[PDB]
Design an enzyme around this catalytic site. Sequence first.
Site, mmCIF file in Angstrom:
data_model
loop_
_atom_site.group_PDB
_atom_site.id
_atom_site.type_symbol
_atom_site.label_atom_id
_atom_site.label_comp_id
_atom_site.label_asym_id
_atom_site.label_seq_id
_atom_site.Cartn_x
_atom_site.Cartn_y
_atom_site.Cartn_z
ATOM 1 N N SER B 167 0.809 -1.197 0.000
ATOM 2 C CA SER B 167 0.000 0.000 0.000
ATOM 3 C C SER B 167 0.850 1.257 0.000
ATOM 4 O O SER B 167 1.629 1.482 0.913
ATOM 5 C CB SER B 167 -0.936 -0.006 1.205
ATOM 6 N N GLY B 168 0.679 2.068 -1.040
ATOM 7 C CA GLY B 168 1.429 3.305 -1.154
ATOM 8 C C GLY B 168 2.558 3.116 -2.130
ATOM 9 O O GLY B 168 3.404 4.003 -2.269
ATOM 10 N N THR B 172 -2.192 2.114 -8.092
ATOM 11 C CA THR B 172 -3.160 3.021 -8.713
ATOM 12 C C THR B 172 -2.558 3.952 -9.761
ATOM 13 O O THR B 172 -3.019 3.975 -10.906
ATOM 14 C CB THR B 172 -3.868 3.837 -7.626
ATOM 15 N N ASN B 207 -1.281 6.050 3.019
ATOM 16 C CA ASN B 207 -1.563 6.800 1.788
ATOM 17 C C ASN B 207 -2.500 7.998 1.936
ATOM 18 O O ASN B 207 -3.613 7.862 2.450
ATOM 19 C CB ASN B 207 -2.165 5.862 0.735
ATOM 20 N N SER B 210 -5.541 6.836 -0.258
ATOM 21 C CA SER B 210 -5.740 5.401 -0.214
ATOM 22 C C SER B 210 -7.026 4.905 -0.885
ATOM 23 O O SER B 210 -8.109 5.345 -0.562
ATOM 24 C CB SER B 210 -5.699 4.937 1.252
ATOM 25 N N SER B 211 -6.897 3.974 -1.820
ATOM 26 C CA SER B 211 -8.056 3.412 -2.494
ATOM 27 C C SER B 211 -8.721 2.448 -1.513
ATOM 28 O O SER B 211 -8.076 1.517 -1.037
ATOM 29 C CB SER B 211 -7.616 2.654 -3.746
ATOM 30 N N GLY B 426 -3.498 -2.616 -1.582
ATOM 31 C CA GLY B 426 -2.754 -3.824 -1.269
ATOM 32 C C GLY B 426 -2.668 -4.123 0.212
ATOM 33 O O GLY B 426 -3.469 -3.616 0.997
ATOM 34 N N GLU B 428 -1.742 -4.139 4.039
ATOM 35 C CA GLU B 428 -1.589 -3.023 4.958
ATOM 36 C C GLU B 428 -1.685 -3.539 6.384
ATOM 37 O O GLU B 428 -2.604 -4.293 6.733
ATOM 38 C CB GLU B 428 -2.670 -1.984 4.702
#
Lengths: 151, 772, 136
Positions: B167-168, B172, B207, B210-211, B426, B428
């Site tokens: 994540s991050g 994306t 993030n 963050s999605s 993803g 996390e």
Amino acid sequence: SQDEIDDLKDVFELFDFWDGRDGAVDAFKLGDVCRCLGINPRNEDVFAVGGTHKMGEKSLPFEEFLPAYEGLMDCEQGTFADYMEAFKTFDREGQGFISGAELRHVLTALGERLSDEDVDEIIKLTDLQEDLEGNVKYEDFVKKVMAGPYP
Amino acid sequence: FSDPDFQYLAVDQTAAFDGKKNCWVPDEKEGFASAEIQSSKGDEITVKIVADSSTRTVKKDDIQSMNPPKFEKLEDMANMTYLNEASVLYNLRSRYTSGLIYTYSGLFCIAVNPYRRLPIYTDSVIAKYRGKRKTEIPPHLFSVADNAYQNMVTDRENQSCLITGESGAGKTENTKKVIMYLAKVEDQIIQANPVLEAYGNAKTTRNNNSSRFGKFIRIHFGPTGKIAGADIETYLLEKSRVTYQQSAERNYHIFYQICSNAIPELNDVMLVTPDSGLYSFINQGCLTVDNIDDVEEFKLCDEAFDILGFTKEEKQSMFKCTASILHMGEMKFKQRPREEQAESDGTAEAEKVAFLCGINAGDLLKALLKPKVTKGQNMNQVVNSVGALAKSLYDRMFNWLVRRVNKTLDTKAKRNYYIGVLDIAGFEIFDFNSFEQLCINYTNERLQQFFNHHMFILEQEEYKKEGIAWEFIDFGMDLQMCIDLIEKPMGILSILEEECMFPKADDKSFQDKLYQNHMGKNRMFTKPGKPTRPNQGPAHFELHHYAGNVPYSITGWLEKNKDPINENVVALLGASKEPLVAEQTISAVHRESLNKLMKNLYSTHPHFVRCIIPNELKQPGLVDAELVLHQLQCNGVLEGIRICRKGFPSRLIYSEFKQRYSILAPNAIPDGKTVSEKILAGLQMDPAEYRLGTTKVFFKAGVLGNLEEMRDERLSKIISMFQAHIRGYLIRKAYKKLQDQRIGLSVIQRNIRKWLVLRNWQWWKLYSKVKP
Amino acid sequence: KQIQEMKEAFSMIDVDRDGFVSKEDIKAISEQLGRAPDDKELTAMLKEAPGPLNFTMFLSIFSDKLSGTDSEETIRNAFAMFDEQETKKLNIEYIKDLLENMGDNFNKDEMRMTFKEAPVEGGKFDYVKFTAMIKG
Ligand SMILES: Nc1ncnc2c1ncn2[C@@H]1O[C@H](COP(=O)(O)OP(=O)(O)O)[C@@H](O)[C@H]1O
Ligand code: VO4
Ligand SMILES: [Ca+2]
Ligand SMILES: [Mg+2]
Ligand SMILES: [Mg+2]
């Protein structure tokens, strides 16, 4: 053969005369000379034997000329297969077409380029024509060029 | 090539290098250190650290073979002598600190997050990557996309990119650049992100954007190989962020956009005071977001609703329903010492809500404080059903929103094949992890294992199928387990799912029923360990996920999985005035969505993108070797490269092979499987660099790149030969014209020299004189 | 008509009206007009004729001069062979270029002697008028 070497002779004159008759030809024309005896070497080809990029650079006798032609003989000539193959790689449709614009690009932009003049030239010579969509059957064209100026 | 467009894209290397002295020795800060051996002693090697020039000993079997300066900042790592955690980490980190963030690892790509804008995505650059073969031009994401296109086209099959990472990392950003790329070689498509991201993204510690939902977007193509449509699929949106947000985190982006004053005109339409720190539901954690202008994002989001083709009412229906939420959480309450059922503590805010949703504020608070056979609710049973409502609305808005944006993209045009892109949320690990995370993590697992299957399990299978030759190799990369611990028949989720159907159940029968089944019967399931980060909230058990060990707190997991909104209010809204408002467990449902996604994926020729977070500080150009190295481990990079070097990753159907490589020995071609037997035979090709196959040819690594070399060469020659032919035709055409002038000149030259010498004849002179 | 002149000419040249041309005959008439040749010129000028110069050995040497040449049509064409557009004129720089360094290269003198007469006006050298001048 003799009737052959005689032919080299014949043409050598017409040329050696035009760039000032004196029994010598500008190495920058050695291409066109052989191009007259049928053959069509590639510029890469010609320089390999003695050709030059510019006039004046140097002149040549018939003595040194014989082997340049012996040379430009053993060099590869393109068959119909080959010209058909390569041209296919530009046809997304697969139906023997291409557009004028693109054909122009292939000739002028890819491989040993061809001036923009020689192009409008041979187009007009072979009298190649486009349809309403501006496309041309590259099969026909290749056949004419292959044909000769006098068929 | 001197092309400015390659500043942060093309690699910019000799001496002091002894292939027997220099090596890689383990490190705690850098993961691996450049060492130069000094003295052996059985197993105790004594090396010198090139950096600080300090000294130390190291087991002999812990030294790693370093690569020669020959492979500095190499574009494709499969071409390196040594592919070990220290050679890989060194190559990447080498490139990265120089602007290059893309590197091939064999058949898939590696993207290392830049944390800064790079001039590598311009239209200038896109022009150059078009139709280029991966070896022909620097490593880039465009190349990965451009290639998947060519394959779908020539191979006539669906393509697909699974862009993975932590994540991050860049999942994306890279997914968008791929679409933006494929779109450029349309306007609404690109424009669907701004609205979906506003409603399904949020600041998080990890993030700032963050999605919070899974995204699978397919891009359809027509009979001329052009974009002819597109659809979007989303997965598991964080219903929970709506009403709750851990410290240092924000709620979805919209809510903050809505209270900025980007469009003052709208303030009265939504009935909002431009202050976010005013609404409980969105001021729990963070308010602002370093590098996110809510003002401008609101404008652009508004602007994007227009381009998407949203009627003004439609896009005001959205904005209102979401501003309505900002109020559901303002409705205060009270009891009334006695029974407590509960009474209101005003009505001002509870009306604005009924208003915006087009329902009677009366009939509302009514079916909310004594849901109907009646059954009153206490003071919390209410404030919690309020949240149940907020969450459930937002989950419908988001779903309707996507259906609508697909309305605008499902052009009924003609479709051939497509190229999907998968961006799922993803891995996390936070201070406190609950059901939400298990869901995201279970999701991300899953995916990794896909790569493992298609990469190792798979590769060798095909070798068998075709009926070539080979001996198996165990890369020891399987998570079926972890996967199994969570999804299989008696798994974690299945336990929880069967625990919801019981009204009796609670956070303890669920917790006990869990150990009851997996404690000691599955080693992935382990009692909560000890803190590896401060503020580490409660943990009831730990799971050993591919990319980390996660301590999960199962408190509240029963309500989280069984949703619950007053079937009463669902009646109110069922017949509301607003036209939008009017329009199985979670686990099982999602498990199913996911299984369906996976099923859709398998039917593909996958190209993989691997994202990598450079550090835990969110700052650009800074590397944390340990972390990096660590990823280069749980992702399977090295192994992912061994087979590219070890095995034969190429593969070609004789039908498509003959068509592309006949032009390499045409003086030997009089059946697609024999024609190639000939071509490759003619070329006097080494039996080593390739293999038989029933329906397809197998070329060792690199070889195919080299065949496209010879392929061009010939194609260039032939083109020259036809130009030569054109040169020779034009010459010979003008040959008559050259004999005639040669004569016509000799006339004039010899016949002027005559008239010249005749005037230099005394007789003629004197003659001419007499004339008159 | 080439003859009619020859005679009438031989008449004006044959001063001592004796039907013969003598060193004194030539010298005589020359001087009555423009500068005349020196003895040596006059001597070898006659030695060009085997015996006495009756109107016969006269027409003989003159005819053997103008022999070995082509037509005014044959030449006007060898010219139009570089007059693509058929304008009946050649651009001066062109023709000069042809003669100067092409085929059997001329020389500066051949070049000057040739253009000292040439009819060039407006850049274009009229090869018709010049073919006549050089011929009939
Ligand atoms: N190629 C890139 N160029 C510039 N910034 C990038 C790039 N990839 C990622 N980032 C930065 O990293 C942040 C997180 O990337 P993102 O794609 O949103 O991660 P995730 O994998 O969670 O989707 C982005 O908002 C951006 O700041
Ligand atoms: O932070 V990302 O949820 O878009 O992986
Ligand atoms: Ca010459
Ligand atoms: Mg994302
Ligand atoms: Mg006399």
